[PDB]
């Protein structure tokens, strides 16, 4: 059984068996988390585990609304979005509950990545090494991270499609396959339909395919024709125009031998580049660079049409930077396998020139080093192929140096190598005991909100929570995962971190002006607010919001709820940072002192996660070797009852220490954050009953209503 030769085998039957085994491996591998999570009630809702990224609830809301057949005007529902649409088709065709489909789609579709990897390896007569590469590439750390069970997001096909395009380019270079003329464009369309941001990669790949053609195939018409077709597929033409051109020119080339003259096809390239140009061409690319590579604040380019806002880029986890070791493990689950993968990729390049067309994806992945961990994904399968090639190279070496190795022993060696190098990825899965976006309890609080509020009502929350809130509660939000620039975030930041009088003025005004902006398209909503109430600057207007005698000339068109969950506590200073910024200025206003930490236990002088020693006295802290006096120790025994004990310490001091008995947690904050709407209305349950009605009072979250 093991004595036979697998390396030389590239048959369709063997390749199908390998694809099936690798695909079952990919699925099986992301089934471990489901087995783990299933024993915890905290992760369920509606008899099924819950989704596992914040962004999944956007497409989940969209799917739900497609199934119901409508949404509200200007809830920003992803109705008609690609992933919502595929979810709706599968839901109508299959017998599983909505939550199960939405849970398992990534587990199915992300595993398709196994197909192009080993078909590409097969085009080079290396199918078995392709199998190894597909094993590594399907579960490699960062790829797994964004495609595990419950990662109900657009990432699940975001490498599958470009890899299929690559395969298509390879078949054209090796067999001059005429079906590329059809599939190359079609795939680009599918890619653009599934993930519009793909524009940039497509533009790069097509672009390189052009330069490649000017070099290695400067005379083969099929390359120029497919380039023109692909440029059309990149454009904003309606789909019927695109498909008409693609199928038309395809038949004309496939069944005509007098074919298309070269002048005509250069004309087609010119018409094409003109069309893509009208379609905005290259502008989306420079915009994406502006946000990710150059990290500019004003990315929409509105100098004095907007105010100046804190930059969200340095605030998003996905976009956070990463050190070389973590970069390498993100791509290959290990430093060693990464080095060998890179060597392998070089060797593959200087043996198969066509793999040059893989350089954009590779480049995108490396761009993570400047642009954030998010991007390593794009280098995972290319590099996996590199690793495949390294192995082929190595054993090739071992024969070109006449090393006595049986077939059985070469095969045992291969199986052992693949297992040992795939180990770090499996270990990563085992340890990546990721949890749900929210807890069942929060989903229950938000679903009861659904039965209490109206579809046309708003809840002011932080943008992190916009998609789940709209999913579980079916209401409107001010900000969410895709509406979260500084200019967007400012209002929720203000509502949550200022005092209650101006926070409630801002909740009414911000919800009303957002709703108006659907009909009026303000480039800056705050700027419409300012230049409406006859104020001179942003600061002038905002300071006038502090007035208990504030006139409100905008009539009330809906209820406005405010959502205050316990889990916001640890990101409160970051939330606060947005409204801490003078819009006239861009300038920071106050310093914001905050942190939350857990005791390690107790003897005698408590230590906490963050190295902050709490005095035995409960009268001073010791941060970084410096002892700082406390103004007060607030001992909170009931977040819902608002039962707490305010111990005065030093009227001359300025920092507060809070103990959360119901969580065994400590908070260290300043006067400005202590008086914020969140800390008062959530932690201490002190709210102006003339301004808000308490709708939900729970230790894990509070919901208030304006009036």
């Amino acid at each position: 059984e093991l004595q036979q030769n697998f390396t030389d085998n590239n048959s369709i039957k063997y390749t199908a068996i390998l694809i099936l085994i690798a695909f079952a491996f990919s699925v099986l591998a992301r089934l471990y988390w489901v087995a783990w999570a299933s024993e915890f009630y905290e992760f369920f809702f509606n008899d099924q585990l819950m989704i596992t990224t914040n962004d999944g609830y956007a497409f989940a809301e969209g799917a739900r609304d497609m199934i119901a057949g409508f949404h509200q005007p200007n809830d920003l529902s992803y109705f008609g979005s690609s992933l919502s649409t595929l979810t709706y088709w599968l839901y109508s065709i299959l017998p599983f509950s909505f939550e199960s489909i939405i849970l398992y789609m990534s587990t199915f579709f992300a595993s398709l990545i196994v197909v192009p990897i080993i078909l590409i390896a097969r085009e080079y007569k290396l199918t078995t090494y392709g199998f190894i590469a597909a094993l590594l590439g399907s579960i490699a750390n960062s790829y797994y991270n964004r495609t595990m069970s419950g990662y109900y997001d657009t990432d699940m096909l975001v490498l599958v499609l470009p890899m299929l395009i690559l395969l298509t380019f390879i078949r054209l270079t090796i067999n001059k396959d005429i079906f590329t003329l059809l599939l190359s464009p079609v795939f680009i369309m599918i890619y653009l339909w599934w993930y519009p941001s793909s524009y940039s990669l497509n533009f790069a790949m097509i672009g390189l395919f052009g330069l490649y053609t000017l070099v290695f195939h400067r005379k083969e018409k099929i390359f120029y024709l497919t380039i023109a077709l692909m440029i059309i597929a990149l454009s904003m033409l309606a789909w019927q125009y695109k498909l008409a051109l693609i199928v038309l020119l395809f038949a004309i080339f496939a069944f005509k031998e007098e074919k298309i003259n070269f002048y005509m096809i250069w004309a087609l390239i010119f018409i094409s580049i003109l069309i893509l140009h009208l379609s905005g061409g290259l502008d989306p690319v420079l915009y994406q660079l502006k946000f990710y590579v150059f990290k500019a604040s004003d990315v929409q380019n509105l100098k004095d049409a907007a105010f100046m806002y804190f930059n969200v880029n340095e605030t998003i986890m996905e976009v956070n930077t990463i050190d070389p070791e973590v970069f390498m493990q993100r791509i290959s689950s290990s430093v060693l396998v990464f080095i060998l993968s890179f060597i392998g990729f070089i060797l593959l390049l200087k043996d198969h020139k066509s793999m040059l067309l893989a350089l954009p994806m590779l480049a995108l992945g490396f761009m993570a080093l400047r642009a954030g961990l998010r991007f390593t994904i794009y280098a995972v399968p290319v590099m996996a192929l590199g690793f495949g090639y390294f192995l082929y190279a190595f054993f090739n070496f071992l024969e070109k140096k006449q090393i006595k190795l049986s077939l059985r022993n070469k095969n045992i060696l291969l199986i052992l190598i693949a297992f040992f190098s795939i180990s770090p990825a499996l270990m990563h899965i085992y340890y990546y005991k990721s949890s749900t976006v929210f807890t069942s309890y929060e989903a229950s609080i938000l679903n009861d909100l659904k039965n209490k509020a109206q579809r046309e009502d708003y809840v002011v929350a932080w943008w992190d929570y916009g998609y789940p809130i709209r999913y579980y509660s079916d209401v409107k939000t001010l900000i969410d995962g895709g509406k979260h620039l500084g200019k967007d975030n400012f209002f929720s930041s203000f509502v949550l971190s200022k005092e209650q009088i101006p926070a409630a003025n801002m909740a009414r005004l911000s919800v009303e002006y957002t709703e108006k902006s659907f009909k009026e398209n303000y480039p800056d909503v705050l700027k419409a607010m300012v230049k409406d109430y006859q104020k001179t600057s942003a600061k002038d207007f905002l300071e006038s919001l502090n007035d208990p005698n504030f006139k409100i000339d905008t009539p009330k068109t809906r209820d406005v709820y405010i959502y205050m969950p316990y889990r916001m506590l640890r990101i409160m200073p970051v939330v606060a940072q947005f409204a801490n910024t003078n819009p006239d200025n861009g300038e920071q206003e106050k310093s914001l002192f905050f942190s939350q930490a857990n005791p390690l236990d107790q003897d005698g002088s408590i230590t906490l996660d963050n190295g902050v020693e709490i005095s035995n006295d409960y009268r001073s802290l010791k941060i970084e070797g410096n002892s700082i006096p406390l103004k007060a120790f607030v001992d909170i025994e009931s977040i819902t009852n608002g039962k707490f004990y305010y111990n005065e310490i030093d009227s001359k001091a300025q920092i507060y220490l809070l103990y959360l008995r119901e969580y065994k947690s400590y908070v260290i904050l300043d006067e400005s954050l202590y008086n914020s709407s969140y800390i008062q209305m959530f932690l201490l349950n002190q709210y102006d009953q003339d301004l808000f009605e308490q709708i939900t009072n729970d230790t894990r979250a509070k919901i208030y209503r304006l009036k």
Partner: peptide, 8 residues
Amino acid sequence: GDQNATFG
């Protein structure tokens, strides 16, 4: 790590 959520 890979969340369109807030950190800090």
